[PDB]
Amino acid sequence: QKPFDKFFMDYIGPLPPSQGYLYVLVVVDGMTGFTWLYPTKAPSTSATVKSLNVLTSIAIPRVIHSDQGAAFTSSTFAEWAKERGIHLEFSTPYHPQKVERKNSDMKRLLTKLLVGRPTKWYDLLPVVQLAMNNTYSPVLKYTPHQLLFGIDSNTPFANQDTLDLTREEELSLLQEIRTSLYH
Amino acid sequence: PQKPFDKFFMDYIGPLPPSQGYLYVLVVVDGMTGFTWLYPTKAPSTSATVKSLNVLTSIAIPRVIHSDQGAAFTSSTFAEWAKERGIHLEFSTPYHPQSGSKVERKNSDMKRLLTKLLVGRPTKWYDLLPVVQLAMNNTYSPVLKYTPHQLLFGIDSNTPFANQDTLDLTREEELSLLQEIRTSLYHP
Numbered sequence: 311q312k313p314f315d316k317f318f319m320d321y322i323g324p325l326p327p328s329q330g331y332l333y334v335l336v337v338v339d340g341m342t343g344f345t346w347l348y349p350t351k352a353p354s355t356s357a358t359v360k361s362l363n364v365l366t367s368i369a370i371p372r373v374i375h376s377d378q379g380a381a382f383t384s385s386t387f388a389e390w391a392k393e394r395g396i397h398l399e400f401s402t403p404y405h406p407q408k409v410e411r412k413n414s415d416m417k418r419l420l421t422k423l424l425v426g427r428p429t430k431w432y433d434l435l436p437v438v439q440l441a442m443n444n445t446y447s448p449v450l451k452y453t454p455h456q457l458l459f460g461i462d463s464n465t466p467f468a469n470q471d472t473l474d475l476t477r478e479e480e481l482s483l484l485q486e487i488r489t490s491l492y493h
Numbered sequence: 494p495q496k497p498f499d500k501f502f503m504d505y506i507g508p509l510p511p512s513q514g515y516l517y518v519l520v521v522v523d524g525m526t527g528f529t530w531l532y533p534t535k536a537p538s539t540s541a542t543v544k545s546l547n548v549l550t551s552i553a554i555p556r557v558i559h560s561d562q563g564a565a566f567t568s569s570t571f572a573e574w575a576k577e578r579g580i581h582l583e584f585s586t587p588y589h590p591q592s593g594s595k596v597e598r599k600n601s602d603m604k605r606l607l608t609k610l611l612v613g614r615p616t617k618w619y620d621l622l623p624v625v626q627l628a629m630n631n632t633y634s635p636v637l638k639y640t641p642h643q644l645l646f647g648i649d650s651n652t653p654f655a656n657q658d659t660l661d662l663t664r665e666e667e668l669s670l671l672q673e674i675r676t677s678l679y680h681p
């Protein structure tokens with residue numbers, strides 16, 4: 311298999327109103343575990359399509375998996391997916407999601423972090439993403455960023471422990487994610 | 494010791510025909526790899542620029558962003574967004590080496606081409622924007638010897654597509670775009 315071949319996606323929220331945003335679309339690459347976070351106003355098809363058009367400008371996935379939230383089961387979303395050539399796969403009573411709990415724990419953690427920062431979470435979201443993808447996974451044996459961008463690639467970060475963060479609210483965020491993500 | 498995400502070039506193109514609520518595209522180019530991000534927006538405003546760049550900087554914080562002195566980029570709101578993130582903002586001036594040179598010509602060529610492709614599909618360019626970006630980043634550069642995608646994600650890393658010639662695109666609406674891009678990109 312390959313990166314960008316399959317995505318798992320879900321909405322978290324409603325979150326505390328931060329700069330007018332109430333939800334985050336969480337999209338995870340199935341192979342590398344690389345996570346993209348897209349803040350939105352609603353868990354809607356429109357916002358889902360907006361976000362995924364940005365993501366799928368990089369590569370078009372073979373498959374996307376989600377639960378049956380309204381955003382994902384609409385005929386509009388279905389038509390978007392059909393046109394792009396993307397097969398949609400839903401969590402069904404007869405379909406097998408580990409494969410569910412992994413996502414559940416990370417989304418729980420995600421929600422805790424964002425709700426725990428009521429008015430700043432929107433501005434910190436980019437730091438959350440960055441921190442998650444540059445955190446070592448015991449399952450992977452590398453970080454998701456290493457797996458997407460190349461293990462021995464020269465990274466954008468001068469300091470792999472701080473990730474070139476300097477602000478205290480950001481550094482404590484990185485500390486909290488590093489110690490909670492897979493434990 | 495140059496690396497991806499060291500330096501961004503950014504600019505707006507537009508106004509374009511209003512496709513699904515959008516009138517502009519923020520064009521961001523990584524200086525090392527030549528990898529291009531395209532973000533559709535309703536306006537060439539600070540708030541649109543911040544919103545778009547917040548998505549991009551979820552991947553990495555650039556050290557320098559180079560733009561013209563457009564109102565969106567010289568506002569104090571945008572200065573504070575950048576200062577808070579340790580991003581150095583650099584502006585085109587009449588005595589700046591990168592404007593009126595090889596860097597400017599290459600950037601202006603790209604943006605002329607982008608504009609042409611989008612204005613040519615007044616109602617549907619928004620739907621096709623992701624195909625434009627894909628095709629740009631997965632076309633070979635004689636200058637580089639590689640594609641921008643190879644340069645950003647790794648030369649030996651897995652190609653997103655499966656068919657090199659078509660990039661897995663099946664609709665002729667998309668294959669038309671790919672042909673234009675392949676023909677025109679580095680033959681300006």
Ligand SMILES: [Mn+2]
Pocket residue numbers: 320321377379
């Ligand atoms: Mn859900």
Ligand SMILES: [Mn+2]
Pocket residue numbers: 504505561563
């Ligand atoms: Mn401009």
